[PDB]
Coordinates of C-alpha atoms and ligand atoms in Angstrom, one line a residue:
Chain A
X1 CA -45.3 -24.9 -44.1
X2 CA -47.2 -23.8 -40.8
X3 CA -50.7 -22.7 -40.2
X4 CA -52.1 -19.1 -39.7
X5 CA -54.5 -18.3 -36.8
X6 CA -58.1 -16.2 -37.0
X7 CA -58.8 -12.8 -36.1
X8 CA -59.6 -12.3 -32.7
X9 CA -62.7 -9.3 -31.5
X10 CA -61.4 -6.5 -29.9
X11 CA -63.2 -4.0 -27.5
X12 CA -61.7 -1.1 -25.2
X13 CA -62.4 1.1 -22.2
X14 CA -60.3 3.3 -19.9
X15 CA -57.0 2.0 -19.6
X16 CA -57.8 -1.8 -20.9
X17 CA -58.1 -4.2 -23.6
X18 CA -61.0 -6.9 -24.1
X19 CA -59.7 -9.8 -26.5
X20 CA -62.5 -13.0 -27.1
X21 CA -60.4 -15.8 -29.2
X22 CA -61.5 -18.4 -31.4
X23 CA -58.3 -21.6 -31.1
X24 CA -58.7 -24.4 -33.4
X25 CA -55.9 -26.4 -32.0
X26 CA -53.4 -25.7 -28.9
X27 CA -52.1 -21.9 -29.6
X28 CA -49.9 -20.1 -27.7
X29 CA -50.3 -16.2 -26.2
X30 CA -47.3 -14.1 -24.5
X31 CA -47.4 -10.4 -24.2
X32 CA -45.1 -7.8 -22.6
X33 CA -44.7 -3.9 -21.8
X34 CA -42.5 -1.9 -23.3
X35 CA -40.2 0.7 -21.8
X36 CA -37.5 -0.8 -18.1
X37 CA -39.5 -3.4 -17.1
X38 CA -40.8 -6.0 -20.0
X39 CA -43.1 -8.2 -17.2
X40 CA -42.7 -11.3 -19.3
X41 CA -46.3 -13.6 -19.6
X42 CA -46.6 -17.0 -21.2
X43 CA -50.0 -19.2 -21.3
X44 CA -51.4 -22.0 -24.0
X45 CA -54.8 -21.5 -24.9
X46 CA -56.9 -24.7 -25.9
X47 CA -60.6 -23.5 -26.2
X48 CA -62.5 -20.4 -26.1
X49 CA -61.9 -17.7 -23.5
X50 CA -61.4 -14.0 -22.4
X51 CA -58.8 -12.2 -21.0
X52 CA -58.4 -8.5 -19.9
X53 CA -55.4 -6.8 -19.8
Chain B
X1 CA -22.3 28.3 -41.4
X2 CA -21.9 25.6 -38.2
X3 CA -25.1 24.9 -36.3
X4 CA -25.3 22.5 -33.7
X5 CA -28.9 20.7 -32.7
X6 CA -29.9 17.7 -30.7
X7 CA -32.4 14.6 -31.5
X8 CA -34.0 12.3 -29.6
X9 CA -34.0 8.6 -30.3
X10 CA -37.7 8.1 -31.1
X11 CA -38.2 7.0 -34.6
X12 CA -41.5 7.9 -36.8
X13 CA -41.8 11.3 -35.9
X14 CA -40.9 14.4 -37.3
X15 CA -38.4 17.6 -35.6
X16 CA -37.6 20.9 -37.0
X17 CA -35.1 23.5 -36.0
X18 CA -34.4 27.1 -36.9
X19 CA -31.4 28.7 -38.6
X20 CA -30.6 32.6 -38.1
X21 CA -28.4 34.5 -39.7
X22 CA -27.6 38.0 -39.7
X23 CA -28.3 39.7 -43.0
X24 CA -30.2 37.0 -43.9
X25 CA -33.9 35.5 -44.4
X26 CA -34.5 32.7 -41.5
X27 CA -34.3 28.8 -42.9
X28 CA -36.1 25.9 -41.2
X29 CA -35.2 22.4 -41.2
X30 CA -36.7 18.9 -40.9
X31 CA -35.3 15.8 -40.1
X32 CA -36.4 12.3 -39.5
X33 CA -35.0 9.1 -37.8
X34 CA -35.9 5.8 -40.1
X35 CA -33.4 3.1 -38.3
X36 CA -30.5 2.6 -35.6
X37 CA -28.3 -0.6 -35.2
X38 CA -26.1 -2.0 -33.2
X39 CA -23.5 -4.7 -33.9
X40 CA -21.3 -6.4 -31.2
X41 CA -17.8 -8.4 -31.5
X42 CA -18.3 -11.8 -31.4
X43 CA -15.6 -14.7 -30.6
X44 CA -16.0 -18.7 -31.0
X45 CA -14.9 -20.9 -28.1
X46 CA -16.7 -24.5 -29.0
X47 CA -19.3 -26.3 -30.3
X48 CA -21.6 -29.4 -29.5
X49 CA -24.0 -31.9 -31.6
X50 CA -25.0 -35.3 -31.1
X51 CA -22.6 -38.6 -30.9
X52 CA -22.4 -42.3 -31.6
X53 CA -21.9 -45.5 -30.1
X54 CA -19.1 -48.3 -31.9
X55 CA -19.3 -51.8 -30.5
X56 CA -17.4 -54.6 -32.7
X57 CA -18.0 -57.9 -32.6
X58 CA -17.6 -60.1 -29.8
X59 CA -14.9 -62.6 -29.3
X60 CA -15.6 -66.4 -28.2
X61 CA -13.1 -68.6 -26.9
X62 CA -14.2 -71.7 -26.0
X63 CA -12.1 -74.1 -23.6
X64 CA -9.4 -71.4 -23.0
X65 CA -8.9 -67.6 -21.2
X66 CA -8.6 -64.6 -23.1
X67 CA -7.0 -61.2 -22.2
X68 CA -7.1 -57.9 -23.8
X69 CA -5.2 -54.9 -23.7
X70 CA -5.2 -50.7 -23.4
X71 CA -5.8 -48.5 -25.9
X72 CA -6.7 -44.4 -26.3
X73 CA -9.5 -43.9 -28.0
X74 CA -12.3 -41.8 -26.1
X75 CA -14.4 -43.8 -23.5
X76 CA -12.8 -47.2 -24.0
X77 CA -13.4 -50.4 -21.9
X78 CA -13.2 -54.2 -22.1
X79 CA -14.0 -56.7 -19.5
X80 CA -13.8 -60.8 -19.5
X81 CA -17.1 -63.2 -18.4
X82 CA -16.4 -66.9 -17.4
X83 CA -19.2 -69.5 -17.8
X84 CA -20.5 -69.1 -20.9
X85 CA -22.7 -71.1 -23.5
X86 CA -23.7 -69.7 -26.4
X87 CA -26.3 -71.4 -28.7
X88 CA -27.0 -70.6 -33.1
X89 CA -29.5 -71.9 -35.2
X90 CA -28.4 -75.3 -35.8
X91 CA -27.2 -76.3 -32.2
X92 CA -24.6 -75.6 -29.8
X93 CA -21.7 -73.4 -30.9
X94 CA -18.3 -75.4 -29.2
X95 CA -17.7 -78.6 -28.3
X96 CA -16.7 -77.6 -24.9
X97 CA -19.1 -77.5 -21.6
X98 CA -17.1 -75.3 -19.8
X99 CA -13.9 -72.6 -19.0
X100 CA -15.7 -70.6 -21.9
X101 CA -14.9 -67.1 -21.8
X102 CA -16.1 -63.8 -24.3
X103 CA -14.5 -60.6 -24.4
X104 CA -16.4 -56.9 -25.2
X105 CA -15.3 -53.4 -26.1
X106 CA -16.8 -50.6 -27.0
X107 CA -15.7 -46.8 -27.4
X108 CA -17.6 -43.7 -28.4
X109 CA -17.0 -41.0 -31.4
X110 CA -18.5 -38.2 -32.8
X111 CA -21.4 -38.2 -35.3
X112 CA -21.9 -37.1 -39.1
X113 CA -24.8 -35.1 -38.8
X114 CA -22.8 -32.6 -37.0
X115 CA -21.8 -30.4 -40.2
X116 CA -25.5 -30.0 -40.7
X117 CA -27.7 -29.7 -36.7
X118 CA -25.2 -27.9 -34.3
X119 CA -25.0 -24.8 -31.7
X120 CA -22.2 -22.3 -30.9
X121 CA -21.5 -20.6 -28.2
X122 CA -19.3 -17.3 -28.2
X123 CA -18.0 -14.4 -26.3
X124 CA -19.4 -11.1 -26.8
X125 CA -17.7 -7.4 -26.4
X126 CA -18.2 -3.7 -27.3
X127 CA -20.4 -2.9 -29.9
X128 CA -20.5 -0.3 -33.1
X129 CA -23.7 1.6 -34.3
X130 CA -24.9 3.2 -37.6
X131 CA -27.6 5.2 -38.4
X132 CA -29.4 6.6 -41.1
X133 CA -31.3 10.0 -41.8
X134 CA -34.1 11.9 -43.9
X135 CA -33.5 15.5 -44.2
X136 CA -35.8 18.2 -46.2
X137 CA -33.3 20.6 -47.7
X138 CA -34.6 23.3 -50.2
X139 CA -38.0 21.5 -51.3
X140 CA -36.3 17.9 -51.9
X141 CA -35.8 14.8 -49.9
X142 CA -32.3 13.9 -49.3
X143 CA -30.9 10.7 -47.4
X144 CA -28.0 10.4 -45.5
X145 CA -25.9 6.9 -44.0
X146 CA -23.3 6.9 -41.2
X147 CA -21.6 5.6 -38.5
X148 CA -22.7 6.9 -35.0
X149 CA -19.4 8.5 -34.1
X150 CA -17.6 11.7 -34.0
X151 CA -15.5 10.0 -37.1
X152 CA -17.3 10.0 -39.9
X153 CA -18.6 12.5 -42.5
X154 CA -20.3 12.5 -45.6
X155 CA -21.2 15.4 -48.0
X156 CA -24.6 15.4 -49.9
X157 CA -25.7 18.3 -52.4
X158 CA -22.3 20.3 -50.9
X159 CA -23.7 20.4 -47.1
X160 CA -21.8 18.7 -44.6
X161 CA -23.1 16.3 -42.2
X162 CA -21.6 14.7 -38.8
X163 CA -23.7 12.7 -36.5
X164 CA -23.0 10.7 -33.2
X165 CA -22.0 9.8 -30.5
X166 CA -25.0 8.2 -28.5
X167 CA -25.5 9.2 -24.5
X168 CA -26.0 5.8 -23.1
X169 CA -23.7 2.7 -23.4
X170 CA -26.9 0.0 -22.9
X171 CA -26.4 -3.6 -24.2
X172 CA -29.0 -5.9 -24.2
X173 CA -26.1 -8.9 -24.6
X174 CA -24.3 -10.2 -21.8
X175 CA -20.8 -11.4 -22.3
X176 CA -21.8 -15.0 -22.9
X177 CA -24.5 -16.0 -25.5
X178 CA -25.6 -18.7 -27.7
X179 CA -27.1 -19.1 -31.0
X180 CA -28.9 -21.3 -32.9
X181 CA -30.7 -21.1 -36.1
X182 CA -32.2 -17.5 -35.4
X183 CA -32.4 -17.4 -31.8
X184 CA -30.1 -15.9 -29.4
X185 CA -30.1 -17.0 -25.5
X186 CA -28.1 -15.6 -22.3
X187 CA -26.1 -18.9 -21.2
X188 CA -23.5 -19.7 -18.7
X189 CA -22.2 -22.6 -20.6
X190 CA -19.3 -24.8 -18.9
X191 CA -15.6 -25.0 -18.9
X192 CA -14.1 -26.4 -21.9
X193 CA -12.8 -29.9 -20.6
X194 CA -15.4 -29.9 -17.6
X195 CA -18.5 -31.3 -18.8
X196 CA -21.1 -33.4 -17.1
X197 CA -22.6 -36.4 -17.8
X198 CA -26.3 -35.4 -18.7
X199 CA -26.3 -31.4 -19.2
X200 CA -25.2 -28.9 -22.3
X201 CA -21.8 -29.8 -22.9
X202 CA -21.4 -33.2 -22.9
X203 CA -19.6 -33.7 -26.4
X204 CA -17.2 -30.3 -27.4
X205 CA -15.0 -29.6 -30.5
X206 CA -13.2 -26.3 -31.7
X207 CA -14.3 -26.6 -35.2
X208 CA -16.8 -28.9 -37.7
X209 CA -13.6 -29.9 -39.2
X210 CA -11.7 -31.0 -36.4
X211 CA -10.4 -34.5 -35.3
X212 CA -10.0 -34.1 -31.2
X213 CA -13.2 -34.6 -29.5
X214 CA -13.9 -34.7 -25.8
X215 CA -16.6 -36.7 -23.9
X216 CA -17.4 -37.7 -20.9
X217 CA -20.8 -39.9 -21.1
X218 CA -20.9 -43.1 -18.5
X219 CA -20.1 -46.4 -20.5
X220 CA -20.4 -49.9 -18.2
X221 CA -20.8 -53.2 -19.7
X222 CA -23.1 -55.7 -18.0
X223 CA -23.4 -60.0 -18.0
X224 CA -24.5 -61.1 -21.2
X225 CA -28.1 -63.4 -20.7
X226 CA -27.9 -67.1 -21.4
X227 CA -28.2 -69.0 -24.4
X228 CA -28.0 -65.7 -26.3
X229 CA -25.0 -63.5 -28.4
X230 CA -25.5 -59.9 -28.0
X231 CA -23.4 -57.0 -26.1
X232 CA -25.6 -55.2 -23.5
X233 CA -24.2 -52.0 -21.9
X234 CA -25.8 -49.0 -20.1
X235 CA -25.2 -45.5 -20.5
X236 CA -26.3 -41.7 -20.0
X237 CA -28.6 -39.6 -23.0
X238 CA -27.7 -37.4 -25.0
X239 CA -27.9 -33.9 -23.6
X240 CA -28.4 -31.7 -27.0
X241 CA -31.5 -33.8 -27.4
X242 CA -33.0 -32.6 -24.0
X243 CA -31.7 -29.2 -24.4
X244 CA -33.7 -28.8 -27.3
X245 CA -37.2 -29.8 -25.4
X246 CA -37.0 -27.5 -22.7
X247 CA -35.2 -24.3 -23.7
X248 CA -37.6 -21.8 -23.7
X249 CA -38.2 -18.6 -24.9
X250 CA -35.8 -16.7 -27.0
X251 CA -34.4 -12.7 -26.1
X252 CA -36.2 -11.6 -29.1
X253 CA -39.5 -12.3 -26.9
X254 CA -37.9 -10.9 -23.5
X255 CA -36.0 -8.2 -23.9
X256 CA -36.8 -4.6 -22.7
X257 CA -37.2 -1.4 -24.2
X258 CA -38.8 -2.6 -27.2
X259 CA -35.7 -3.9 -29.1
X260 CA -35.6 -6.5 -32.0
X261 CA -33.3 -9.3 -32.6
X262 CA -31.6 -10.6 -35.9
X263 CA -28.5 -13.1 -36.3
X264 CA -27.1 -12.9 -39.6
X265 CA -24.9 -11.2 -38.2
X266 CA -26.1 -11.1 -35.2
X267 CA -27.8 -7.3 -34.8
X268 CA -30.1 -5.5 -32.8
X269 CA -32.4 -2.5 -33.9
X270 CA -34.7 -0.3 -33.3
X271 CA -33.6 -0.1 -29.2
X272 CA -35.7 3.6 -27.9
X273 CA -32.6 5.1 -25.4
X274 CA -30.9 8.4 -25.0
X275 CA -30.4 11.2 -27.8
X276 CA -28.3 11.8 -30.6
X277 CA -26.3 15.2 -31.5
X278 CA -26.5 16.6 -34.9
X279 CA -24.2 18.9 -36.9
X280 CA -24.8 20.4 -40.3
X281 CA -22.5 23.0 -42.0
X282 CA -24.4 25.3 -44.9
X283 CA -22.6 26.8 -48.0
X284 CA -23.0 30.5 -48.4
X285 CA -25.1 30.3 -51.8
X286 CA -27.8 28.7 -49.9
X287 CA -29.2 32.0 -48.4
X288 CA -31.6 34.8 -49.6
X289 CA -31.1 38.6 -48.1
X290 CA -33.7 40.5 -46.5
X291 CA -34.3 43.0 -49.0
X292 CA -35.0 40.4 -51.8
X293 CA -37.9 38.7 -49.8
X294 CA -41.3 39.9 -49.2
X295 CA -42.3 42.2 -46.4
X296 CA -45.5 41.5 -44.6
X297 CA -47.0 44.1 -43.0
X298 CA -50.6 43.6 -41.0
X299 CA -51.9 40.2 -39.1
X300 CA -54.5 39.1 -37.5
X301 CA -56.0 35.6 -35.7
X302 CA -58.7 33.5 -34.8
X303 CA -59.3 29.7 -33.8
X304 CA -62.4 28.2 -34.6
X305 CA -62.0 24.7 -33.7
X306 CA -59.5 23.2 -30.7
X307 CA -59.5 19.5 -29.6
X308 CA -56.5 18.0 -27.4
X309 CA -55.9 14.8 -29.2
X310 CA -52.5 12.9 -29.7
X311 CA -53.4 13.8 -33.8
X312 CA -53.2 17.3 -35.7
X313 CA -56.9 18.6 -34.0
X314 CA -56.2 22.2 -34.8
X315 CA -56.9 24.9 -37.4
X316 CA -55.9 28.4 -37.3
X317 CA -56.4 31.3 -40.2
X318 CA -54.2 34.8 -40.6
X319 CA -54.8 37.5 -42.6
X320 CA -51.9 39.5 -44.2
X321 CA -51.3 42.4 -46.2
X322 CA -48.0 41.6 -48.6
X323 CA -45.9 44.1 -50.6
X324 CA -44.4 41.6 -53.4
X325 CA -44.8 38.1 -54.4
X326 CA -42.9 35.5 -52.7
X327 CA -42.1 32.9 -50.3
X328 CA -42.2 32.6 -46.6
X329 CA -41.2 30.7 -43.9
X330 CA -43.7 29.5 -40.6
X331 CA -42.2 28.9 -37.2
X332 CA -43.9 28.9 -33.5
X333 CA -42.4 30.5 -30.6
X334 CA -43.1 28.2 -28.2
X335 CA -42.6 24.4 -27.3
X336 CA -45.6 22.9 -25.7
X337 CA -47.9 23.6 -29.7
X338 CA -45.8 22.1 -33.0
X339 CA -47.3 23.5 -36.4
X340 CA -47.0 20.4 -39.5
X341 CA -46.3 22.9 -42.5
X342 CA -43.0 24.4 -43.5
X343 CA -43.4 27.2 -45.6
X344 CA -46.2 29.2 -47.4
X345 CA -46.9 31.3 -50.7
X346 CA -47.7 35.1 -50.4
X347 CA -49.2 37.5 -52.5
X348 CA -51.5 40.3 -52.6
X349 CA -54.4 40.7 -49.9
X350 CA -55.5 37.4 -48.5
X351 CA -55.9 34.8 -45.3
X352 CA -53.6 31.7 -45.1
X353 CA -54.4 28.1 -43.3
X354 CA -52.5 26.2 -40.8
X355 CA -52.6 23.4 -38.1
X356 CA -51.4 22.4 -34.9
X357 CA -51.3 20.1 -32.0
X358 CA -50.9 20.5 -28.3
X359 CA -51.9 19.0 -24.7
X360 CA -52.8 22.4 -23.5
X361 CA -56.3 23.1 -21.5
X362 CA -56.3 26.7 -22.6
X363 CA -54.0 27.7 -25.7
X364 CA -52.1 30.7 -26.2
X365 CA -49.0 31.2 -28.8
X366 CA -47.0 33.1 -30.9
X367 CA -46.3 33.0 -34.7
X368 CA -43.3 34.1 -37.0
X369 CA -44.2 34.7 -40.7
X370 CA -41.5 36.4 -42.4
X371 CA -39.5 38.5 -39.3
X372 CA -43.4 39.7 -37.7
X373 CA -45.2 38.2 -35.1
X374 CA -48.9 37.7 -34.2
X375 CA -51.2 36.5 -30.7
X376 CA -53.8 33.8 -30.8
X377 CA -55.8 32.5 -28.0
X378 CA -58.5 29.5 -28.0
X379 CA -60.1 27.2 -26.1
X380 CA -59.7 23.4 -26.1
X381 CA -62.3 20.3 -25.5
X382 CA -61.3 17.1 -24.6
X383 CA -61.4 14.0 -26.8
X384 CA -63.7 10.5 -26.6
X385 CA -61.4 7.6 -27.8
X386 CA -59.5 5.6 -25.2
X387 CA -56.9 4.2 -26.9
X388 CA -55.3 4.4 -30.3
X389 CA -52.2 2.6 -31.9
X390 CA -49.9 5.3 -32.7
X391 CA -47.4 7.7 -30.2
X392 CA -48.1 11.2 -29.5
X393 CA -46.7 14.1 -31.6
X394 CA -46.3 16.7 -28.9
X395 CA -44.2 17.3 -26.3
X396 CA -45.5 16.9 -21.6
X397 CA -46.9 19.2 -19.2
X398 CA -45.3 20.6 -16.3
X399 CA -46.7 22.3 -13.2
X400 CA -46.8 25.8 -14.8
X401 CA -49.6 24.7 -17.5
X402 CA -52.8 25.5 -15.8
X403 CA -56.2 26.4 -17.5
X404 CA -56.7 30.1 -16.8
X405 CA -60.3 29.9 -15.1
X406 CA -58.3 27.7 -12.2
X407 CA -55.1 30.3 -11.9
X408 CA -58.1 33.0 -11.0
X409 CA -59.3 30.9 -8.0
X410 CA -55.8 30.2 -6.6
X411 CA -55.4 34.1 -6.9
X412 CA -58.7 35.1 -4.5
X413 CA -58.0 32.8 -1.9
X414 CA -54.2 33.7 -1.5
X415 CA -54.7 37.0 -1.6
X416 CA -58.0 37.0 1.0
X417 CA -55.8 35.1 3.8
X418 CA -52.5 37.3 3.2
X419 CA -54.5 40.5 3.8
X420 CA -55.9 39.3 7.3
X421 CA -52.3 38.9 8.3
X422 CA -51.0 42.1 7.1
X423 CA -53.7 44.3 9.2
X424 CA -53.3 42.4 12.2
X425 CA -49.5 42.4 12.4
X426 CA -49.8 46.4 12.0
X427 CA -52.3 46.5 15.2
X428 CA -49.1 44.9 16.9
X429 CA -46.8 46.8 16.5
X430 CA -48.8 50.3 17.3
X431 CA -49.1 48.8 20.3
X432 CA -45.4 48.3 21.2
X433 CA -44.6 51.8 20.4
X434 CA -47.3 53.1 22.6
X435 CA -45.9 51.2 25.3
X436 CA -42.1 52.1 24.8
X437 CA -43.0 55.4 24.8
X438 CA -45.4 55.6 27.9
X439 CA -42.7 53.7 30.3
Ligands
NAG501 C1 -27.6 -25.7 -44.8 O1 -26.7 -26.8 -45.0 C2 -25.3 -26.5 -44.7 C3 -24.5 -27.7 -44.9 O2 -25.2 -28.6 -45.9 C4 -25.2 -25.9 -43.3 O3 -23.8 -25.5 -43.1 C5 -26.1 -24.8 -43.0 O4 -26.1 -24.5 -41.6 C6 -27.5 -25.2 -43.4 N1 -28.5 -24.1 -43.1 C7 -29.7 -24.3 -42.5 C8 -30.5 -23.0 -42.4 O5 -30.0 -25.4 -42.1
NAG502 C1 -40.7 13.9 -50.1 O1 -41.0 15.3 -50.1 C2 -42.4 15.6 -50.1 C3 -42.6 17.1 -50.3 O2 -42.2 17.5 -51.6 C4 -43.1 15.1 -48.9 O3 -44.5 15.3 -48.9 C5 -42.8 13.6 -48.7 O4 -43.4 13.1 -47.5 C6 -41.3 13.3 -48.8 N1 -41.1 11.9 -48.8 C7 -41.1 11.1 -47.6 C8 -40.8 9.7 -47.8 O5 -41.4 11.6 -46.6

């Protein structure tokens, strides 16, 4: 059995996503586009932070 | 009745098509995508796990030299020391001070575990595909299951149905892949019978169940330390072991277009590329002639409301005058605005309800109710929301789809310049005449 993580706050604006997170303990994050070109992204997260995408 | 349509390969959202017969009341279809699969052809070359190291005992010979001899297991060696004393618990072990000799040997098989904690590695070719339909047919839901190829067909309710084949040949496998446990990877794994010392492909066998292993690990045996009984040696890791530290991420994770990835069997679905053709073949019983169905006589529009959003933002109402009761059919006569419902009840003197979607500025469309036609025109706002979480339900733009109050402008200004060049070319040529006709 493995561990589920918390919801993370969401806001938006023109053509971007704000994400605030909450880690417990070392979690990872990875996102990519869809459609030719997937533009692959990979980072570990160990305390509180923001990211815009 | 044949009739021949095509589908793109975008799944959640609803298509309709038209079917007109002479003699006959119109039909309209609807048809929805739910899933798409392909499956390749896979082929086993070898597989690895994790292996063991044997070392019997030694062999002491005190005053005296021993020899050994060849033999074929995997990774064997043997080597002779001079000058040795060995020491146990309750003193010295032979009488003998010196011209002592041991002898070592050690060779290396293949563990147990393997039936249990292993990887594969195969060779991949041409794949099939399958597909499977919703279709709305007479005021039921139907389903439909096939292979996407001209050579299959299946009969449901006594219509015929034929799909396939797909317009692109895209793969997301290469012809080498490995798998393990759930996870596929894109691999150039080595030659069997050419492995390396500390790298994937160290240890290989055909099968779980076979006897012949290969390896090729470093084995050297070093000087045993004084006063002490023990066989020292030195060799290379395992490579499984590191493999499985540093591997990264899997294809599911990677690959493009959106696709997922299963491995029992090994599948992929859902992959958003090219169209699909569709054919349908419809008994004769199915239709109703123009003189049984209602006739419809006067129509009129309005739009109250118009927003431009990727959801149903649209309302429209008709009025209609009806000579029987009945049932009729709804259908738009153009492809840029897409109307949700299918068919409508008639009677009497009365106004009907509909809605629609569309990415126009400024609106304007036709609509087909039972074999008349009527003209609406509205104007459109735009919405607030940046971003939502579901696709679009209408169709692009192109460069023809301008709002009306910027088509006027382009108009004026055109026309203004043109004019000033068609009076001054006709003072030219006056001019020539003249002159022609003095000289
Ligand atoms: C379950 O164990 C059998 C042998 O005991 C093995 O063949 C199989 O791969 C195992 N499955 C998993 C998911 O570990
Ligand atoms: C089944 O048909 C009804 C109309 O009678 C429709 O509203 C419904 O969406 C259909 N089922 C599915 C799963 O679409």
């Amino acid at each position: 059995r493995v561990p589920k993580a918390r919801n993370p706050t969401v806001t938006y604006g023109k053509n971007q996503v704000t994400m605030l997170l909450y880690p417990d303990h070392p979690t990872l994050l990875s996102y990519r586009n869809m459609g030719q070109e997937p533009n692959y992204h990979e980072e570990w997260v160990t305390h509180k932070k923001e990211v815009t995408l | 009745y044949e009739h021949v349509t095509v589908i793109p390969n975008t799944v959640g959202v609803p298509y309709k098509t038209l079917v007109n017969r002479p003699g006959y009341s119109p039909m309209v279809l609807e048809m929805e995508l739910q899933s798409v699969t392909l499956e390749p052809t896979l082929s086993l070359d070898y597989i690895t796990c994790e292996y063991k190291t044997v070392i019997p005992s030694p062999y002491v010979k005190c005053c005296g030299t021993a020899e050994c001899k060849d033999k074929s297991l995997p990774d064997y060696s043997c080597k002779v020391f001079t000058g040795v004393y060995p020491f146990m618990w309750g003193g010295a072990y032979c009488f003998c001070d010196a011209e002592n000799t041991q002898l070592s040997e050690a060779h290396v098989e293949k563990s147990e575990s393997c039936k249990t904690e292993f990887a594969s590695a195969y060779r991949a070719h041409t794949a099939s595909a399958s597909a499977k339909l919703r279709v709305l047919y007479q005021g039921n839901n139907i389903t439909v299951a096939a292979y996407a190829n001209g050579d299959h067909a299946v009969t449901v309710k006594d219509a015929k149905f034929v799909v396939g084949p797909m317009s692109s040949a895209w793969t997301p496998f290469d012809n080498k892949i490995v798998v393990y446990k759930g996870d596929v990877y894109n691999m150039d794994y080595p030659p069997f019978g050419a492995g390396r010392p500390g790298q994937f492909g160290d240890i290989q066998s055909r099968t779980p169940e076979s006897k012949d292993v290969y390896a090729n690990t470093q084995l050297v045996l070093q000087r045993p330390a004084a006063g002490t009984v023990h066989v020292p040696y030195s060799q290379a890791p395992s490579g499984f072991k590191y493999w499985l530290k540093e591997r990264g991420a899997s294809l599911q994770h990677t690959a493009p277009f959106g696709c997922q990835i299963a491995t029992n069997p090994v599948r992929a679905v859902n992959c958003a590329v090219g169209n699909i053709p569709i054919s349908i073949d419809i008994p004769d019983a199915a239709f109703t002639r123009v003189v049984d169905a209602p006739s419809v006589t006067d129509m009129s529009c309005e739009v109250p409301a118009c927003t431009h959003s990727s959801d149903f933002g649209g309302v429209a109402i008709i009025k209609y005058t009806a000579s029987k009761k009945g049932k009729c059919a709804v259908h738009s006569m153009t492809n840029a605005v897409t109307i949700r419902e299918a068919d409508v009840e008639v009677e009497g003197n009365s106004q009907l309800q509909i809605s629609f979607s569309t990415a126009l500025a400024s609106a304007e469309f036709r609509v087909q109710v039972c074999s008349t036609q009527v003209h609406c025109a509205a104007a459109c706002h735009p919405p607030k929301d940046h971003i939502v979480n579901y696709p679009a339900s209408h169709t692009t733009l192109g460069v023809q789809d301008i709002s009306t109050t910027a088509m006027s402008w382009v108009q004026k200004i055109t026309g203004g310049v043109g004019l000033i060049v068609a009076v001054a070319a006709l003072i030219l040529i006056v001019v020539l005449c003249v002159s022609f006709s003095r000289h």
